[PDB]
Amino acid sequence: PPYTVVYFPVRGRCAALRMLLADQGQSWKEEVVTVETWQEGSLKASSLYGQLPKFQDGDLTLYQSNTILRHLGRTLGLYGKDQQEAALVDMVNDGVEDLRCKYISLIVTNYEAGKDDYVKALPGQLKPFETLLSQNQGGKTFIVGDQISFADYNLLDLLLIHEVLAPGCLDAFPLLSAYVGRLSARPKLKAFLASPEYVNLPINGNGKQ
Amino acid sequence: PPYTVVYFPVRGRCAALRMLLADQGQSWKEEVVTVETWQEGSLKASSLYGQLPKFQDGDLTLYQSNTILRHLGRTLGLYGKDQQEAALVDMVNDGVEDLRCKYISLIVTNYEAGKDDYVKALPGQLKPFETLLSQNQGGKTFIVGDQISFADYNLLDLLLIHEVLAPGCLDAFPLLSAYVGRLSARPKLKAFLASPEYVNLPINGNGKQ
Ligand SMILES: [Ca+2]
Ligand SMILES: [Ca+2]
Ligand SMILES: [Ca+2]
Ligand SMILES: [Ca+2]
Ligand SMILES: [Ca+2]
Ligand SMILES: [Ca+2]
């Protein structure tokens, strides 16, 4: 620390890492980049790969939402108990990222024509996470092992935005349904999810959800 | 160990992790899944996310190429010297993954219409890795720090396939050019890159490169 999130005025790819920081009792600063400021060019030109989020942690500057999640995961001890669990955490997070990419593609490039096919395919895309929960303490704790990991926050975000896209999509998945309610009720995370800094941002920048 | 790679008869998303295993003096089995066998449906249905590679390490079964890379990275000490370098390794690997997804999209979905624009955009996409090298001991060692990491193998693969797509694309990037030569000359990696198990596979499954 100190932590600074540099991003567009949306939840998007920073939602999960913000939930992680709030739930872990961390403070951070939000530095907002508007679409007009981004269009100007200076920050884009100065970013490593031409994209946001940028994240500052003391004198470390990071780019890439999943890099930030893994960093916070490693530094705050949210990375499983041993190397095998760490692999499982990664496997879950990579699967979340895969579906998030498909979600973003729908939202940004193909919402109207693609939503129907996307929602039809959704149960099959969500089932693996239910299966993973079923194989871990009957789905009663976390996605991997018995302590929260960075993957849980990313998975929780994915589930939350999918319930908005396709209300009731978790109804067929009792373990995923209970997991969302259960993680969301964690006192610091509950407060954050209720707070203006979360509630007053749109999920995505183009108005679609 | 023992290690088993389960994949299509292509280099694709297993090329980097195979280079890593070979360079680290590891043996592994290749179990080939044909397109005809894959279309039958049993392995697909049994896979966590409906995709290959599947990787077996003793009694651990993993999916997701970058999960496999990080697991091998963690277990073989190819993950930087401390937490900060580990974040930097992740940042590099996520950037490689981003460009690989763009590469795969071109190859699988849009090769003939998209190649011109892709190749015009390519120098801008490669420059960050040159910059990263420039900032690490003048580009003379590895992508992050003083020892090889899993991200090096993934970046090396990305560079090799791009030289096949766009011969001479590294000519403008002396640190990236020298880096490909230098890593490729590491004795165990050199041997592997010359071996029938590498040379006799196509880069991609659809004949394009
Ligand atoms: Ca912990
Ligand atoms: Ca319900
Ligand atoms: Ca129902
Ligand atoms: Ca090492
Ligand atoms: Ca040259
Ligand atoms: Ca030249």
Curated annotation (Swiss-Prot), chains A, B:
Give the sites modified to N6-acetyllysine: K127
Domain GST C-terminal per the UniProt entry, residue ranges: 82-203
Q: Keywords on this record?
A: Acetylation, Cytoplasm, Lipid metabolism, Mitochondrion, Nucleus, Phosphoprotein, Transferase
User: Where on the chain is Phosphotyrosine found, per UniProt?
Assistant: Y3, Y198
Listed binding positions for glutathione are Y7, R13, W38, K44, Q51, L52, Q64, S65
Specify whether Transferase is a keyword of the entry. Answer: yes
Q: Where can this protein be found? A: Cytoplasm; Mitochondrion; Nucleus
Q: Which CDD domains does the annotation name?
A: GST_C_Pi, GST_N_Pi
Pfam hit, one: GST_N
EC code: 2.5.1.18
Which domain of life does this protein belong to? Eukaryota
Q: What is its main location?
A: cytoplasm
The terms under GO molecular function for this entry are: dinitrosyl-iron complex binding; fatty acid binding; glutathione peroxidase activity; glutathione transferase activity; JUN kinase binding; nitric oxide binding; protein serine/threonine kinase inhibitor activity; S-nitrosoglutathione binding
User: What is a single cellular component term in the Gene Ontology annotation?
Assistant: secretory granule lumen
- Catalytic reaction annotation: RX + glutathione = an S-substituted glutathione + a halide anion + H(+); prostaglandin J2 + glutathione = prostaglandin J2-S-(R)-glutathione; prostaglandin J2 + glutathione = prostaglandin J2-S-(S)-glutathione; prostaglandin A2 + glutathione = prostaglandin A2-S-(S)-glutathione
PTM N6-succinyllysine: list the residues.
K102, K115
Phosphothreonine modification sites are: T61
| GST N-terminal domain sequence ranges | 1-80
Q: Which family does it belong to?
A: Belongs to the GST superfamily. Pi family.
Q: What does this protein do?
A: Conjugation of reduced glutathione to a wide number of exogenous and endogenous hydrophobic electrophiles. Involved in the formation of glutathione conjugates of both prostaglandin A2 (PGA2) and prostaglandin J2 (PGJ2). Participates in the formation of novel hepoxilin regioisomers. Negatively regulates CDK5 activity via p25/p35 translocation to prevent neurodegeneration.
How it assembles, according to the record, is: Homodimer. Interacts with CDK5.
Its name, as the record gives it, is Glutathione S-transferase P
Organism the protein comes from: Homo sapiens
Gene from which this protein is expressed: GSTP1
